[PDB]
């Protein structure tokens, strides 16, 4: 539907001040921008709760133009555009194009009022039949409007709820990841993030997968989401979600896609869960995580299982994902090693500043690890330290 | 020192992703950007607490270039650059140019580590008299470094403390404004705001004034501050602060400066406090407040005083700043008036969505006031409403 | 079963440290506390989304005791305690009693893990019949568990969504209040608030009303909610929600109930919308709002309508709700009035520190208004002020 | 003067609603409560910036009683109570006793106005002598008042700044810990925390140490701070800070003090940095951390140094603090281990739900680790998992 470079540019300019919003609406056809925003809104809207179907008219204004979209809203159906004559219009919602840009893709504070105009029952002519129409549609029009307006803003969603909405197992039964994802990701939400997740989902099934990609799209209103899978997943692609076919164990492939699409604020490994793959992808992609970014590994349970290249004995971890996580502790501490002119700190040593481990999910913080080791003039035995620190007492 | 349009462009690009940061460093000379960032850092640093004077070397790296700045840090003096030989270097602080841009002017999450490199006592050769140097400088180097690093980030300051630091009476004695300012302004801090304050301070004194402008500059890390005063205040101008000479009671002048420098996220009237002036400035400048922005009026105490054009009787308020505020309540409510084809809502009616009043300070929220009045089918008397709302009971 | 004084005492102690949690479970029978917590959980749970009915076992543990509750979870039905044999148990959720107290009623940080134990398919025999059962109940058990767990915590809800859920017109069609309520109320959520709303809803209908009271109960996990209505609303009452029958225009009655149930952190007038009533209730109840609390008035539109005692001319506001709000501006500013020996500041003058007005909703901040007026040595005319502030410069 | 049990009880009640505040001021002598609050305020005040010495009168009112405290405020000196005649009174600050309790020790929202009354130059006679006094004391009174008022609230401090102020090496030169401490601790600030830090500071010096204990007291307005040191540190003790003399390597002693003073929301090891000691203290004290609490270890650098019982080879970590941290990863993952009837999960296994490692500082999250391992019906090899997850597609 929309060119990815264009969408990213729209998001980039929408994040600016008045001059950037004006630049955007000058650079691109306002009609096209309007269609882009409607596409985003349709994916952003929560599930409708109204049993009686209603229409919500969304009118987008720019200059002398008015782009009218009639949205059919009913429980157990996705919100979709229809013809004006295809139901009862419960509400007219009016946005200025630049205001809707700010609300969806802007860097903005929460605005409790004044972002739009609203005209209830906009075509209900005041005659004898009106009272009947009011009784039938009053509740449904309130519920339908609430759903559409929720899709016109950037309010922070509940990851646990999105997980269930999108049929991904991140929370609720096998796993309990989303509170950790929320804590680690929420501070990135006003940024134009590039997120790469390895493992789109659905494996060989021709129709399944994409639930977690949808989740990140919903969570990051200004984000671009990339999903990597060995199987074709092009049926998942939509506005702000691109899938790529390839093997996470192919370092040459990883180089090309990282240099094409990166650098990434967030990389998540939810792929094969083969231990060697986890290690290969980390080695290849950690360099392409932005400073201040995150590398996440999901499902370390496979570290203990030979069928995934793991080992039943937790101490025999040299080739496992948990062996990697343990080594990252030494990487963090590398500046504390006794000096050796024959030893140079490696890339990971120099570039990890935090490790967070929870049950079956770990977060690695990318950044410059150059705080300085304990200086040579601090004693390297306890008694000497006490003496040095006691001021002659 | 620096071209205002360049500074604004630097801040605009610094708020972007990797591509915008690369664009910035390609567009402008990295040496010039380095000097710009140092200028910002020097204004951002808190007062040093160290009694013993130390140097903190700040090295800014970009490609093969390394821009070194030696900052003299001592209690009761502003941090300033000096020659490398002008004291003991307690700390070397290393930043990549693009990382420092992000930390000062970026749209960024809080980064608790990994933004810089640090090398303590960087030139202290390990001979016999190092012990002496360590004892003299250990505490001062810690304190000096803490001060410099505070100036290298975008942590939210305390407005009440800035008010004392910059000698403005917003808090502590006559007035208690800063907690309200903090509550209303804090959500704007990751935006590239344009703030206009009427009333620079110092009146006719050739050297005084500018304290509140410095406060806003400190509070809004990506902001451009404008100060309007009838007296010349050009001595106040610095990076991100421009003063303008003119009369707040001159509507033509206000049009020109608003269209030249606006639209404004925030406008504050702290000027003459003449009631007619407050009302004139509001009428002229409210249209130039951005939707989602704020118009602030300070010092409404003058509403009661003839010498400022006010009235001792609080009921005789048709020409006072408090009369204005009272009328804003009706403006907010204007859609609830009974219909009249001879009456059109005015500009303020259509554009106010909130009013906040505290002792001697009021905040007006700019936005589209078009929610819809109570529909005609809601009864206009109590009994009729009760009967209509009771379902036949 | 649950005495109001007991519930409030449970909430009070639950907000404490380890010594208070131990005190609570020693003071009261753990079995009763367990039932009370389950009652709360049932009201907190979001609507279930699973088509296939499942059971979630909630086991509350204290000492050598284990209180087992089997909760039936299915879309379009309220979550209800059933017998162990009345369905497939998709999940066992285990909470220590003191931990569940902290999670529902405590003053606590967000805890992303470690508050409970979970055992999926807890009674599913590992045999040839398992695979079909897994296929049938996997998604339903996940969705069922999520709904229950959401009810076992204190996460802030979306007020706008609750408006549609509880059928109150605070947001979505006629009004757009909830974002303002959220901004003004969210900072109170870890306090044991007492909230009084005038106007329960439903008017004379024998079944309708209570939606906004439910909303405040959900928003304030440690709160006690009171609803006043001229009509009987006893069918609305549930844990942490009490309704009172009476007239908001009776000042002596208002003082009686305020003494009995106050002081209130929050009072909301969403009642008759008769202008005289709004003014009577405010004068009577503002003194019973806590310092740091809020008095809220909803639906000021009636200020312009003679059918509610209003006036079409906005300047004729001496008897309207908007006239009251305008007067609150002068009350805030009262210390700035010129000196007068026979004029003394009134109660409202001395006790208002903020006013917030939005379309059809206003928030009044109760607190000590005693900052001091501009001192007499600050000049009372512009030209003299310039001179006094210029340090001799001419 | 102030009994520790009494201080903790005051904080406990101050955190309640109106009924608890009334109970507090009925249970204890209001004059004593006012002295207690003044002692707290004095420790909370930031360094004064005014060159000219001023007095700020703090008047605490309860019932018909008025407790007057005259505070001397000048740069480079701690704020201290003096006689009324010992300087110029720049400002009178008035608090009701229950309001000051809420502001210092309450569970409260931020209140931007209405908490107090202020009367500038309260005893300055309006005559020909006033103008000179105003000129001398205007700026000093403003800055003086600002310092005192900052001490009368519960605003979050900057931990990095406090590190410089209290002379502790947590941030600025050798270490860069405070941003991590802020991130992990800030959500606890509303709670009546019990914090134990091993290592008070100063080692054998008779006067040095205590900086980090002061830091935690400042950061946690409702907290009780405990500091363990092998050396006597009784000179550090003040309101809400207790030092304990003893050896962190004595597990039986550690259990004794943990029973006496716990359970702890937060334990920090910043002690000897001997590897055996770090491991002993963790095993002994982790059971005494509350669910939802934190165990913090500082200065793991010593893991690499034989002079602290460490090893230069990072792989030789079986006895080091880093070996402990690595093992906690397996503890977190313990439910994923293949079945073994003779193997039983240990205490740490069952009670760790998170691990955070930064340069020279690590945070361990205490909680119930009982989420359940991957079920037996999820295939234990990649190829079988592909097949089971592909719905028949080949
Ligand atoms: N070597 C490899 N490289 C890339 N993807 C692989 C792979 N081996 C398996 N996969 C894919 O990894 C996916 C794991 S399932 C991913 C689930 C998804 N993240 C969610 O939460 O909804 C499967 O779709 C599988 O096809
Ligand atoms: N008609 C007019 N137009 C613009 N500025 C005016 C004016 N009359 C007075 N002023 C200026 O308004 C200022 C008021 S004092 C401003 C103080 C400043 N906002 C602070 O907080 O520090 C004086 O500097 C005075 O010169
Ligand atoms: N004099 C009076 N005193 C108290 N309540 C009154 C009253 N006159 C009318 N009411 C009640 O005020 C209510 C107004 S409707 C309240 C709606 C509710 N707050 C909600 O948001 O869902 C009606 O139930 C009506 O019975
Ligand atoms: N075995 C032991 N048990 C308890 N404390 C010990 C100990 N060995 C050394 N110590 C104490 O541990 C302290 C380490 S220095 C602590 C510094 C302090 N936390 C701060 O940040 O300012 C010294 O005071 C030393 O006396
Ligand atoms: Mg997964
Ligand atoms: Mg002013
Ligand atoms: Mg209402
Ligand atoms: Mg230490």
How far apart (Å, rounded) are the C-alpha atoms in residues C221 and B337? 39
Residue located via tokens 């502030």: C389
Instruction: For the beta carbon of residue D305, count every other beta carbon within 10 angstroms.
Output: 21
Contact B177, B170 (CB under 8 A): yes
User: SS3 sequence, A14-37?
Assistant: HCCCHHHHHHHHHHCCHHHHHHHH
Distances (CA, A) of B267 to A79, B286, B328, B362, C191: 40, 8, 17, 12, 36
Burial of residue C194 (CB within 10 Å: 0-12, 13-18, 19+) is buried
Give the residue from A353, A379, A198 showing the smallest Cα distance to A290.
A353
Strand order from edge to edge, sheet including C54-62: C80-82, C65-73, C54-62, C89-96, C117-120
* Residue in A62, A69, A180, A273 annotated catalytic: A273
Instruction: Give the contacts of C379 (CB within 8 A, at least 6 positions apart).
Output: B307, C385, C387, C388
How far apart (Å, rounded) are the C-alpha atoms in residues A169 and A208? 13
Q: Which ligand is nearest to the CA of D174?
A: 8
In this structure, the strands spanning A89-96 and A54-62 are parallel
Q: Is the dihedral of CA C241, C244, C245, C250 positive or negative?
A: negative
Q: 3-state DSSP call for residue D120?
A: strand
* Residue in C180, C273, C277, C288 annotated catalytic: C273
* Residue in B69, B180, B273, B288 annotated catalytic: B273
- Cβ distance A112 to C179 less than 8 Å, yes or no, reads yes
Does the annotation mark D359 as catalytic? no
- For residue A170, the CA-to-ligand 5 centroid distance in Å is 7
How far apart (Å, rounded) are the C-alpha atoms in residues C201 and C208? 7
Query: Which of D112, D149, D169 comes nearest B180 by C-beta?
Result: D112
- Cβ distance C356 to B360 less than 8 Å, yes or no, reads no
Q: How far is C-alpha D173 from the geometric centre of its chain's CA atoms?
A: 22
How far apart (Å, rounded) are the C-alpha atoms in residues B213 and B224? 10
Question: Counting one residue from B and one from D, how many pairs have CB atoms under 8 Å apart?
Answer: 82
Contact C241, C214 (CB under 8 A): yes
- For residue A169, the CA-to-ligand 1 centroid distance in Å is 13
Query: Which of C20, C94, C126 comes nearest D376 by C-beta?
Result: C126
What resolution in angstrom units was achieved for this structure? Answer: 1.9
Strand partners of residue B67: B60
Burial of residue B35 (CB within 10 Å: 0-12, 13-18, 19+) is middle
How far apart (Å, rounded) are the C-alpha atoms in residues A306 and A312? 7
Instruction: For the beta carbon of residue C44, count every other beta carbon within 10 angstroms.
Output: 21
Query: Chain C within 8 Å of D172 (Cβ-Cβ)?
Result: no
Query: Chain D within 8 Å of B117 (Cβ-Cβ)?
Result: no
* Residue in D69, D180, D273, D277 annotated catalytic: D273
Query: Which strand (E) or helix (H) includes residue C277?
Result: helix C275-285
Contact D205, D174 (CB under 8 A): no
How far apart (Å, rounded) are the C-alpha atoms in residues D360 and D301? 6
How far apart (Å, rounded) are the C-alpha atoms in residues D180 and D363? 9
Backbone angles phi, psi at A226, to 5 degrees: -115, 135
Query: Chain D within 8 Å of B142 (Cβ-Cβ)?
Result: yes
Nearest CA in chain C to B180: C354
Give the residue from C224, C267, A170 showing the smallest Cα distance to D371.
A170
Contact B195, B185 (CB under 8 A): no
Q: Is the dihedral of CA C384, C386, C389, C393 positive or negative?
A: negative
| Token pair of A127 as six digits | 């005659």
- Cβ distance D117 to C366 less than 8 Å, yes or no, reads no
How far apart (Å, rounded) are the C-alpha atoms in residues C132 and C89? 15
Query: Which strand (E) or helix (H) includes residue D113?
Result: none
How far apart (Å, rounded) are the C-alpha atoms in residues A364 and A352? 7
State the nearest Cα–Cα gap between A81 and chain B, in angstroms.
Answer: 24
How far apart (Å, rounded) are the C-alpha atoms in residues A229 and D46? 57
- For residue C201, the CA-to-ligand 3 centroid distance in Å is 5
How far apart (Å, rounded) are the C-alpha atoms in residues D152 and D104? 6
Contact C214, C184 (CB under 8 A): no
Contact A9, A2 (CB under 8 A): no
Furthest-apart CA pair in chain A: how many Å?
Answer: 99
Strand order from edge to edge, sheet including B80-82: B80-82, B65-73, B54-62, B89-96, B117-120
Strand partners of residue A57: A70, A92
Give the residue from B362, B366, B392, B389 showing the smallest Cα distance to B377.
B389
Nearest CA to ligand 4 atom 25: D203
| Token pair of B148 as six digits | 């410099």
- Cβ distance B353 to A114 less than 8 Å, yes or no, reads yes
D272 lines ligand 4 (CB under 6 A): yes
Termini Cα distance of chain A: 77
In this structure, the strands spanning A241-245 and A224-229 are parallel
Angle between helices A30-44 and A4-14 (to 10 degrees): 90
Helix ranges, chain A (H): 4-14, 18-27, 30-44, 97-105, 130-150, 159-165, 178-185, 211-219, 251-261, 275-285, 321-332, 347-351, 382-388
Residue located via tokens 């605490």: D60
Contact C239, C36 (CB under 8 A): yes
| Token pair of C191 as six digits | 């306090």
Query: Chain D within 8 Å of A314 (Cβ-Cβ)?
Result: yes
Give the residue from A388, A375, B134, B137 showing the smallest Cα distance to D203.
A388
Q: C3-20 burial, b if ≥16 CB within 10 A, otherwise e?
A: eeeebbebbbbbbbbbeb
How far apart (Å, rounded) are the C-alpha atoms in residues A369 and A328? 12
3-state helix, strand, coil in chain A (%, to 5): 40, 20, 40
- Cβ distance B384 to C307 less than 8 Å, yes or no, reads yes
Distances (CA, A) of B252 to B230, B247, B249, B255, C63: 14, 10, 9, 5, 79
| Token pair of B77 as six digits | 């003096």
D57 lines ligand 4 (CB under 6 A): no
Nearest CA in chain D to C19: D263
| Token pair of B52 as six digits | 């013993």
Give the residue from D240, D267, D237 showing the smallest Cα distance to D255.
D267
Ligand 3 atom nearest residue C270's Cα: 19
How far apart (Å, rounded) are the C-alpha atoms in residues D334 and D348? 10
Domains of chain A are 1-154 (3.30.1050.30), 155-393 (3.40.50.150)
How far apart (Å, rounded) are the C-alpha atoms in residues D323 and D311? 11
How far apart (Å, rounded) are the C-alpha atoms in residues C188 and C293? 9
Q: Is the dihedral of CA D76, D78, D83, D84 positive or negative?
A: positive
How far apart (Å, rounded) are the C-alpha atoms in residues C312 and C317? 9
A392 marked among binding-site residues: no
DSSP per-residue letters across A67-82: EEEEEEE-TTS--EEE
State the nearest Cα–Cα gap between C163 and chain A, in angstroms.
Answer: 9
Give the residue from B307, C377, A368, A262 showing the smallest Cα distance to D129.
C377
Tell me the best of A159, A172, A201 to mutate to test the pocket of ligand 1, counting ligand atoms within 8 Å of each CB and taking the most. A201
- Could you tell me how many residues make up chain A? 393
Ligand 1 atom nearest residue A168's Cα: 22
Q: A188-200 burial, b if ≥16 CB within 10 A, otherwise e?
A: bbbbbbbbbbbbb
B248 marked among binding-site residues: yes
| Token pair of B89 as six digits | 């270097």
- Cβ distance C391 to B205 less than 8 Å, yes or no, reads yes
| Token pair of A244 as six digits | 């790529």
How far apart (Å, rounded) are the C-alpha atoms in residues C82 and C79? 10
- For residue B99, the CA-to-ligand 8 centroid distance in Å is 29
Distances (CA, A) of B390 to A291, B387, C169, C208: 62, 5, 15, 8
- Cβ distance D146 to B161 less than 8 Å, yes or no, reads yes
- For residue A167, the CA-to-ligand 1 centroid distance in Å is 15
Nearest CA in chain C to B274: C382
Peptide bond into B249 cis (omega under 30): no
Strand partners of residue D81: D71
Q: 3-state DSSP call for residue D379?
A: coil
Backbone angles phi, psi at A92, to 5 degrees: -110, 120
Tell me the best of B271, B280, B361 to mutate to test the pocket of ligand 2, counting ligand atoms within 8 Å of each CB and taking the most. B271
Give the residue from A8, A10, A79 showing the smallest Cα distance to A43.
A79
How far apart (Å, rounded) are the C-alpha atoms in residues A75 and C164? 13
Query: Chain D within 8 Å of C5 (Cβ-Cβ)?
Result: no
3-state helix, strand, coil in chain C (%, to 5): 40, 20, 40
How far apart (Å, rounded) are the C-alpha atoms in residues A361 and A357? 6
B298 marked among binding-site residues: yes
B90 lines ligand 2 (CB under 6 A): no
User: SS3 sequence, chain B?
Assistant: CCCHHHHHHHHHHHCCCHHHHHHHHHHCCHHHHHHHHHHHHHHHCCCCCCCCCEEEEEEEEECCEEEEEEEEECCCCCCEEECCCCCCEEEEEEEEHHHHHHHHHCCCCCCCCCCCEEEECCCCCCCCCHHHHHHHHHHHHHHHHHHHHHCCCCCCCCHHHHHHHCCCCCECCCCECHHHHHHHHHHHCCCCCEEEEECCCCCCCCCCCCHHHHHHHHHCCCCEEEEEECCCCCCCCECCEEEEECCCCCHHHHHHHHHHHCCEEEEEECCCCCHHHHHHHHHHHHHHEEEEEEEEEECHHHHHCCECCCCCCCCCCCCCHHHHHHHHHHHHCHHHCCCCCCCCCCHHHHHEEEEEEECCEEEEEECCCCCCCCCCCCCCEHHHHHHHCCCCC
| Token pair of D247 as six digits | 């050896």
Ligand 1 atom nearest residue A277's Cα: 1
How far apart (Å, rounded) are the C-alpha atoms in residues D394 and D387? 8
CA-CA-CA-CA dihedral for D251, D255, D256, D260, to nearest 10: 150
| Token pair of A37 as six digits | 């925003």
- For residue B169, the CA-to-ligand 6 centroid distance in Å is 7
Give the residue from B219, B217, B273 showing the smallest Cα distance to B243.
B217
Instruction: For the beta carbon of residue A96, count every other beta carbon within 10 angstroms.
Output: 17
């Amino acid at each position: 539907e929309f060119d990815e470079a264009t969408v990213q540019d729209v998001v980039r300019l929408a994040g600016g001040h008045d001059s950037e919003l004006r630049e955007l609406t000058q650079k691109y056809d306002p009609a096209m921008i309007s269609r882009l925003l409607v596409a985003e809104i349709l994916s952003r809207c929560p599930p409708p709760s109204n049993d009686t179907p209603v229409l919500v008219e969304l009118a987008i204004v720019h200059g002398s133009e008015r782009f009218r979209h009639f949205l059919r809203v009913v429980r157990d159906s996705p919100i979709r555009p229809v013809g004006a004559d295809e139901g009862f219009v419960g509400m007219l919602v009016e946005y200025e194009l630049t205001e809707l840009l700010r609300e969806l893709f802007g860097v903005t504070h929460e605005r409790p009022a004044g972002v739009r105009g609203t005209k209830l029952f906009p075509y209900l002519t005041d005659d004898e039949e009106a009272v009947e129409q009011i009784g039938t549609y009053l509740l449904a029009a309130q519920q339908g409007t609430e759903a559409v307006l929720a899709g016109c803003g950037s309010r922070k969603p509940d990851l646990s709820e999105l997980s269930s909405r999108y049929f991904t197992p991140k929370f609720g039964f096998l796993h309990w990841f989303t509170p950790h994802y929320d804590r680690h990701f929420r501070d990135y939400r006003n940024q134009q993030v590039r997120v790469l997740e390895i493992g789109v989902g659905g494996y060989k099934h021709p129709e399944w997968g994409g639930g977690s990609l949808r989740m990140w799209k919903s969570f990051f209103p200004r984000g671009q989401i990339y999903g990597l899978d060995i199987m074709d997943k092009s049926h998942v692609d939509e506005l702000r979600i691109r899938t790529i076919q390839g093997d996470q164990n192919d370092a040459e492939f990883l180089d090309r896609i990282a240099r094409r699409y990166g650098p990434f604020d967030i990389v998540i490994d939810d792929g094969s869960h083969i231990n060697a793959h986890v290690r290969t992808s980390f080695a290849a992609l950690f360099p392409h995580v932005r400073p201040g970014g995150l590398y996440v590994i999901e499902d370390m349970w496979t570290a203990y299982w030979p069928g995934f290249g793991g080992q039943a004995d937790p101490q025999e971890c040299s080739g496992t994902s948990l062996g990697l996580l343990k080594s990252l502790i030494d990487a963090i501490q590398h500046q504390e090693l006794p000096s050796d002119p024959n030893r140079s700190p490696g890339y990971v040593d120099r570039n990890i500043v935090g490790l967070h481990v929870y049950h079956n999910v770990a977060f690695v913080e990318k950044g410059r690890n150059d705080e300085g080791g304990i200086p040579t003039w601090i004693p390297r035995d306890f008694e000497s330290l006490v003496q040095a620190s006691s001021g002659g007492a």
